[PDB]
Amino acid sequence: TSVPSSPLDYAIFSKGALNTNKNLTVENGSVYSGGDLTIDGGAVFNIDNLISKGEMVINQDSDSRCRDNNIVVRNIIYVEKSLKANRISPRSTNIDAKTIYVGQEMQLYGAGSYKFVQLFSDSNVKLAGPGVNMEVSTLASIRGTLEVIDGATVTLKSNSAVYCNSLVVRNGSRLILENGAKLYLATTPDASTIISIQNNGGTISYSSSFSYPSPPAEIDEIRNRDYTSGLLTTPLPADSVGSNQLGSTADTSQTPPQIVIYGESYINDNEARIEISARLGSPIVDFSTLQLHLISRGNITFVGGGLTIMNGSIISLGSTFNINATGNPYAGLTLKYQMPSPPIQQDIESNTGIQPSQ
Ligand SMILES: [Mg+2]
């Protein structure tokens, strides 16, 4: 349930708005955006936390070089504003999270399986369209309306507890209660809605007097933490070797070695490889050979036609951040998170000054 305080815990950390590339695969760590977080089609994540301090948007892309979104979050999805899962047939957006909080509206249009242990919304939750299927396994607190339309379904799993102001279900949609599930509604719905509920041994309390569950502590922690406390405005380092526009520090005390690349204005990967080769004193064709940390205040671009595989992390400390693939928008990036070694942690801390609040 703990959410990491330091940008070094993140597979991808963005100070400002984050726009991902298509066919992004992320394994381990967390992902954070201090502004709007736009996830492009074909995201496949298996991460601990996914945080946006703005709007979150999850896109779909029917190009045959693309694929479905499959987002698995072991702890928390946090969205300060609205979450919007867009719809492009015949794609799916599958999301499986322990805890999701959305401060404004949750709008699920793209088909997919959305599975939450606990859901907290400070507004409405709207599912619209064929194949849009949500399951709540334990708890949900929805301060506005739960709207389930146009073929969408919602399943309240056994012994779950769900608290909503209002419920609307119409247009070929269903709300399913499994055994012992408890639904509490502050109001009484219309006839059509009621006849769209399939109650398999649960209980519905209509126009019920109840208190909402409040989001777990972790939520207010995320809301009140300034994730870039202490951040300097010093430009990221550059050095004369390699590419004059980039800087680097290496840790060769392990094998494979670790390296941090700094690009104040941007980083492009073929230029990063020139910096890497110069710093390590050896030829480098790719990155699977290496633990790599890329830190910029501009965009990070992967220029190959093909998939880039890396181990490490990506940190943007600029106002906004795009991960771009210009060889072919579908080239893809696979990122396996790895914590930097202590010397590289210290180097990054020194050059940026981020000091998380204790
Ligand atoms: Mg250089």
UniProtKB/TrEMBL annotation:
Alphabetized UniProt keyword annotations: Membrane, Metal-binding, Transmembrane, Transmembrane helix
Keyword Ribonucleoprotein: no
Single annotated GO MF: metal ion binding
Top-level taxon of origin: Bacteria
UniProt: Mg(2+) binding residues: D239, V241, S243, L246, E275
Protein name: Uncharacterized protein
Residues of the full protein shown: 260 to 617 of 642
